[PDB]
Scaffold this active site. Structure first.
Site, PDB file in Angstrom:
ATOM      1  N   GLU A 157       0.863  -1.216   0.000  1.00 27.75           N
ATOM      2  CA  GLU A 157       0.000   0.000   0.000  1.00 27.75           C
ATOM      3  C   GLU A 157       0.881   1.242   0.000  1.00 27.75           C
ATOM      4  O   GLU A 157       0.661   2.136  -0.808  1.00 27.75           O
ATOM      5  CB  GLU A 157      -0.993  -0.013   1.157  1.00 27.75           C
ATOM      6  CG  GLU A 157      -1.871   1.239   1.150  1.00 27.75           C
ATOM      7  CD  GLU A 157      -2.732   1.415   2.379  1.00 27.75           C
ATOM      8  OE1 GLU A 157      -2.227   1.204   3.545  1.00 27.75           O
ATOM      9  OE2 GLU A 157      -3.916   1.754   2.193  1.00 27.75           O
ATOM     10  N   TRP A 217      -8.175  -1.960  -0.388  1.00 25.26           N
ATOM     11  CA  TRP A 217      -9.017  -0.957  -1.103  1.00 25.26           C
ATOM     12  C   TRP A 217     -10.128  -1.610  -1.930  1.00 25.26           C
ATOM     13  O   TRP A 217     -10.878  -0.872  -2.612  1.00 25.26           O
ATOM     14  CB  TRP A 217      -8.085  -0.133  -1.984  1.00 25.26           C
ATOM     15  CG  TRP A 217      -7.276   0.821  -1.178  1.00 25.26           C
ATOM     16  CD1 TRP A 217      -6.053   0.608  -0.604  1.00 25.26           C
ATOM     17  CD2 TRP A 217      -7.649   2.162  -0.834  1.00 25.26           C
ATOM     18  NE1 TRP A 217      -5.632   1.745   0.056  1.00 25.26           N
ATOM     19  CE2 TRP A 217      -6.579   2.720  -0.090  1.00 25.26           C
ATOM     20  CE3 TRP A 217      -8.757   2.963  -1.120  1.00 25.26           C
ATOM     21  CZ2 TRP A 217      -6.613   4.026   0.383  1.00 25.26           C
ATOM     22  CZ3 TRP A 217      -8.788   4.253  -0.648  1.00 25.26           C
ATOM     23  CH2 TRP A 217      -7.724   4.779   0.073  1.00 25.26           C
ATOM     24  N   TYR A 275      -4.582   9.290  -1.745  1.00 27.97           N
ATOM     25  CA  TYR A 275      -3.245   9.561  -1.143  1.00 27.97           C
ATOM     26  C   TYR A 275      -2.150   9.721  -2.182  1.00 27.97           C
ATOM     27  O   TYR A 275      -1.512  10.782  -2.173  1.00 27.97           O
ATOM     28  CB  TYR A 275      -2.820   8.460  -0.180  1.00 27.97           C
ATOM     29  CG  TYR A 275      -3.673   8.377   1.051  1.00 27.97           C
ATOM     30  CD1 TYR A 275      -3.450   9.202   2.149  1.00 27.97           C
ATOM     31  CD2 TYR A 275      -4.675   7.441   1.144  1.00 27.97           C
ATOM     32  CE1 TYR A 275      -4.229   9.106   3.289  1.00 27.97           C
ATOM     33  CE2 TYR A 275      -5.475   7.337   2.273  1.00 27.97           C
ATOM     34  CZ  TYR A 275      -5.236   8.156   3.351  1.00 27.97           C
ATOM     35  OH  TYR A 275      -6.004   8.044   4.466  1.00 27.97           O
ATOM     36  N   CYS A 331      -8.367   9.315   5.764  1.00 24.87           N
ATOM     37  CA  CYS A 331      -8.425   9.236   7.230  1.00 24.87           C
ATOM     38  C   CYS A 331      -7.143   9.894   7.783  1.00 24.87           C
ATOM     39  O   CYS A 331      -7.250  10.492   8.869  1.00 24.87           O
ATOM     40  CB  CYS A 331      -8.578   7.792   7.695  1.00 24.87           C
ATOM     41  SG  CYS A 331     -10.313   7.292   7.459  1.00 24.87           S
ATOM     42  N   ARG A 333      -8.090  11.795  11.299  1.00 25.63           N
ATOM     43  CA  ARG A 333      -9.432  12.389  11.575  1.00 25.63           C
ATOM     44  C   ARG A 333     -10.421  11.332  12.099  1.00 25.63           C
ATOM     45  O   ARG A 333     -11.309  11.676  12.843  1.00 25.63           O
ATOM     46  CB  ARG A 333     -10.052  13.052  10.340  1.00 25.63           C
ATOM     47  CG  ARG A 333     -10.424  12.114   9.192  1.00 25.63           C
ATOM     48  CD  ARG A 333     -11.280  12.742   8.123  1.00 25.63           C
ATOM     49  NE  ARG A 333     -11.502  11.803   7.061  1.00 25.63           N
ATOM     50  CZ  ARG A 333     -12.459  10.867   7.066  1.00 25.63           C
ATOM     51  NH1 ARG A 333     -13.343  10.791   8.047  1.00 25.63           N
ATOM     52  NH2 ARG A 333     -12.499   9.993   6.109  1.00 25.63           N
ATOM     53  N   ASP A 338     -10.567   3.829  13.597  1.00 29.09           N
ATOM     54  CA  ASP A 338     -11.199   2.532  13.922  1.00 29.09           C
ATOM     55  C   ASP A 338     -10.226   1.792  14.852  1.00 29.09           C
ATOM     56  O   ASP A 338      -9.309   1.150  14.354  1.00 29.09           O
ATOM     57  CB  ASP A 338     -11.526   1.799  12.628  1.00 29.09           C
ATOM     58  CG  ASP A 338     -11.980   0.362  12.864  1.00 29.09           C
ATOM     59  OD1 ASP A 338     -12.018  -0.070  14.056  1.00 29.09           O
ATOM     60  OD2 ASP A 338     -12.283  -0.283  11.862  1.00 29.09           O
TER      61      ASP A 338
END
Ligand SMILES: NC(=O)C1=CN([C@@H]2O[C@H](COP(=O)(O)OP(=O)(O)OC[C@H]3O[C@@H](n4cnc5c(N)ncnc54)[C@H](OP(=O)(O)O)[C@@H]3O)[C@@H](O)[C@H]2O)C=CC1
Ligand SMILES: NC(=O)C1=CN([C@@H]2O[C@H](COP(=O)(O)OP(=O)(O)OC[C@H]3O[C@@H](n4cnc5c(N)ncnc54)[C@H](OP(=O)(O)O)[C@@H]3O)[C@@H](O)[C@H]2O)C=CC1
Ligand SMILES: Nc1nc(N)c(-c2cccc(Cl)c2)c(CCCOc2ccccc2)n1
Ligand SMILES: Nc1nc(N)c(-c2cccc(Cl)c2)c(CCCOc2ccccc2)n1
Lengths: 520, 532
Positions: A295, A317, A343, A403, A423, A426
């Site tokens: 990633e 994703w 990103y 996020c 922000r 989880d």
């Protein structure tokens, strides 16, 4: 109990021994060929000396009283007890151990066989007689394996000061299996690096004040703290994994119940991980890093094509690229797995017009990844070294808004620290991966800028536990962390764009078994 | 010597009386035989918990000390506290609350006697009669509940070991006053959190007359601990003297201390020199107070005009300079713009900074005079709509860091983003600050975003909860160290309150007259460069 009257303790250091299952018995290597399995671990030498030499004169009075009561009656020192084989392993220049009363157990040797200021005892009972005759603070059993076996067998140990050496060596002698019904871990230290290994220190235990009250005059979620027996039993929880587990506990006990699927939430936390001392991959459940390293490499290439990751069997994703997911986002004109200007696009091309995942955006928009590497190299005291994925203009074009809003860098004395502001967090599923992702990224940026990594600092904005993770997280919070692993990078990689998956190694990962956060 | 053997404390609550501030600001005790204020329930709760609390297990040492003192071996030769009241004090208490429950009630009176009263409630007619009575009682502590006259004589006669002083941060008509506590004779050792109760802020301060098995394990776990910098011990004597520092201003002052003691020496642009550290969080409870620093004087007209200017979407520095708000003046000069390579920028054209990003993110910046109506993303409107229509959204962020526009800005924003959180009708805000001038900037920055939180809360029909300040690069300029050492030795006052005009229900409708700071009690101004 004799261990309580005479304050008898064991202190030891144990390494690992030549889909692995881990438990406390993982750490059991004591010795090899009559010496230690490892060359000097200086930090454990330092801890060992501090524990075995420390005395508290003010607390002696009560101890003398207690022993006098039990027995019907210059500088204070501890007693240290060694097996003969242990004694003969110690270099002459370290013997007798300084500022300690040295006691050796032997049948084959007698006092006439020693030049040194030592007591020779030929049976366990004679130690207890000796301890009745001496002025001392505490008594430490120093090993080796025969001595530990017999003292643990007779319940003559109040606590075990146990160093967990998180590396593997050839061993021929082992610490005895500790019976879980007889001894419980009560405290766990910080994680350290010494001589190219991580280690920690745990403790097993045999199984103005009025003004504080007044200021306290003014001091919920169907969580039963007796569901957290082991977690709440620990005295010192200094291992850095407790920054994570303590936030979980806080959200469960004090969290706000909210909607979208239930969560418990709270707002504003910070975690700090010392990457010079350890790689903070959670040990209280099993994590894998291949996916999150692919990633990060995909981010750094500036890619937005979900199929690239899917072709590497990385599915992070997948759900965000489906026809249904894209249509619910009103992205009717987006190809499946075209994640939009997320990103990687923002990191290499901020402000460029996104077209599709196949376009060549060479020299379009702002290459902030190259810019922050140039600032770290050429202007390391800059307060502007920020990498920002939250492109307000592009948010609705993204499969979803990021996020991980931003990374800010800080350089002092040849060392790089990184803050990442998140922000939406989880705690049960995402945050453990997110710690590992930005910890790896800090290492990559440090190396390509010729710096050493220092801290990864994680700021959590909306920090939530899904109601569906609660049962799994109650299981995890009652597990005791293991000393963390270490991350190795290929030192030949000098440019951020030149890393590949085989340039990363995670070493000495010791972990509890995997948890399904959702139990179907 | 006496006050120590018999554990004789004063407990009072003082308001302000109907501009330089000191401890004596808080001196109002009474009006027309009753309390100056309507009824402050939190102080009532504190008063009851302090004057009734006793620790059985700590009595032996107290009785021992008192017997030894009195040349005895026993008191006579359920543990309670003694409470001592003036007759006026006593005769101002209503019947249902007299005698005060679970306390030994004593009343000083020359003109009444034990016949006039009842029960085990003692009358005494001299102060020496209290000492003999205490000599003859089993009690935990003795609390003087006042009357001005009672506090006056017990303080003269040097019979008070500690003062439990409630600071009521509001002004009332008073006819009686607490004595001026002389700084040489008493010192503050502890200060509480700041609260709101019945429309006033207040705090609680304390003046003083001037299984250890797991204890060694703590020493072992500390075996690897080292204190970097040549800041001195004696230099923070007052700061280091306090036992309990619970006042929320200590979140700021503790960071200054941390940076001075542990900060990294670095040399920034203007070779000024800083001490820096990386990553802090402060949290302020806007439901209980407005966190305007009290350890120096702070002004807010400029900071409010700045926010109003941001909200209008303005980038024209002249607007602020024409109101004598000079916060951006240095960043708009010909010399500053030229050094930023903005050769084609008019003086005081700050470029696409906060106000432009908040109202027009992504629009092409032209000049400070252009009409940007309906251009770019109105992020400010969007976050208000999200709070009102989707309050559990985790996407409620207002971001000034436009990577595309940074080089067009006179400088990149220090205040990177605000994130909002809504729970049970209450609004919290996080602001992330990349670069923090602890001595001069951060005090204003806390005020700006605390004000903004109140404005957003109010236009969304919510109550403000927390303002949460995340500091990235946190630094103290070396030229502020002397002034910040003066400041860290000052004890904070209870915080003021902010009042907005309640009629304003749209973020664009606020004007400077809509903002009132009430009950601001503060130490003297400090010039952060060359100590004031
Ligand atoms: N990693 C760690 O924390 C530690 C590691 N070590 C390592 O452990 C190994 C040595 O341990 P191991 O071989 O078990 O040997 P031990 O040090 O336990 O020594 C055994 C000897 O002690 C004597 N002994 C033990 N109990 C009694 C008794 N009750 N009464 C009389 N004598 C007694 C005997 O000496 P004799 O034969 O003379 O009668 C016996 O042979 C080495 O490799 C050393 O480096 C040692 C300590 C700690
Ligand atoms: N804010 C706070 O914390 C507090 C406020 N108050 C307020 O203060 C006011 C009442 O106080 P103030 O008017 O001074 O009255 P006080 O309660 O101090 O009472 C004065 C009376 O107590 C008796 N007394 C005092 N000293 C002696 C002594 N040494 N020997 C014998 N008797 C003594 C005398 O009564 P006699 O005439 O019978 O001899 C004297 O007239 C009220 O307005 C009350 O509400 C009261 C307590 C606390
Ligand atoms: N935690 C811990 N516990 C231990 N019982 C030992 C240990 C190992 C072999 C011999 C002896 Cl005396 C002690 C060590 C190894 C570090 C200290 O090694 C020594 C230091 C000084 C003198 C002798 C040994 N670490
Ligand atoms: N911190 C503090 N200190 C105090 N000395 C008083 C005080 C004021 C007037 C009378 C009395 Cl007995 C006490 C209060 C006011 C709250 C309690 O006041 C009462 C308690 C019991 C009965 C009546 C008033 N708060």
């Amino acid at each position: 109990q004799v261990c309580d009257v005479f304050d008898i303790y064991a202190i030891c250091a144990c390494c690992k021994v030549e889909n692995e299952v881990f438990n406390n018995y993982t750490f059991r290597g004591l010795g090899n060929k009559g010496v230690l399995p490892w060359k000097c671990i200086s930090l454990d030498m330092k801890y060992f000396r501090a524990v075995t030499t420390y005395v508290n004169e003010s607390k002696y009075e009560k101890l003398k009283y207690k022993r006098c009561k039990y027995l019907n009656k210059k500088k204070l020192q501890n007693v240290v007890v060694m097996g003969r084989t242990n004694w003969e392993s110690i270099p002459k220049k370290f013997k007798p151990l300084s500022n300690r009363i040295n006691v050796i157990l032997s049948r084959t040797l007698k006092k006439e066989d020693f030049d040194e200021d030592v007591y020779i005892i030929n049976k366990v009972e004679d130690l207890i007689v000796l301890l009745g005759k001496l002025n001392y603070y505490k008594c430490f059993i120093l090993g080796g394996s025969v001595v530990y076996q017999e003292f643990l067998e007779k319940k003559l140990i109040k606590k075990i000061y146990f160093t967990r050496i998180n590396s593997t060596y050839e061993c021929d002698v082992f610490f005895p299996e500790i019976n879980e019904n007889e001894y419980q871990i009560i405290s766990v230290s910080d994680v350290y690096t010494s001589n190219n290994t991580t280690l920690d220190f745990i403790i097993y235990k045999k199984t103005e004040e009025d003004d504080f009250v007044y200021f306290n005059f003014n001091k919920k979620n169907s969580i039963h703290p007796n569901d957290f027996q082991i977690y709440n039993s620990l005295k010192y929880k200094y291992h850095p994994e407790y920054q994570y587990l303590n936030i979980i506990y806080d959200i469960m006990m004090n969290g706000n119940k909210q909607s979208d699927v239930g969560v418990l939430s709270k707002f504003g936390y910070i975690m700090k991980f010392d990457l010079s001392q350890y790689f903070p991959l959670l040990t209280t459940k099993k994590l894998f890093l291949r996916g999150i390293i692919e990633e990060l490499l995909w981010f750094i290439r500036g890619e937005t094509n979900g199929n690239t990751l899917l072709n590497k069997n990385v599915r992070i994703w997948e759900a965000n690229g489906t026809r249904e997911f894209l249509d619910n986002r009103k992205l009717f004109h987006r190809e499946v797995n075209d994640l939009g200007p997320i990103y990687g696009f923002q990191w290499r091309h901020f402000g460029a017009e996104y077209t599709n995942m196949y376009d060549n955006y060479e020299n379009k928009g702002v290459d902030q990844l190259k810019n922050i590497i140039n600032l770290i190299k050429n202007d390391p005291t800059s307060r502007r070294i920020l990498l920002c994925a939250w492109n307000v203009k592009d948010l609705d074009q993204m499969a979803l808004p990021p996020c991980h809003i931003l990374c800010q860098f800080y350089v002092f004395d040849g060392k790089l620290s990184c803050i990442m502001y998140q922000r939406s967090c989880d705690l049960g599923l995402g945050v453990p991966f997110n710690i590992a992702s930005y910890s790896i990224f800090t290492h990559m940026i440090a190396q390509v800028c010729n710096l050493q990594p220092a801290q990864f600092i994680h700021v959590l904005g909306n920090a939530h536990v899904y109601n569906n993770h609660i049962d799994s997280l109650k299981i995890q919070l009652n597990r005791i962390p293991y000393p963390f692993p270490t991350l190795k990078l290929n030192p030949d990689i000098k440019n951020i764009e030149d890393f590949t998956i085989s340039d990363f190694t995670i070493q000495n990962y010791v972990h509890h078994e995997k948890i399904s956060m959702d139990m179907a």
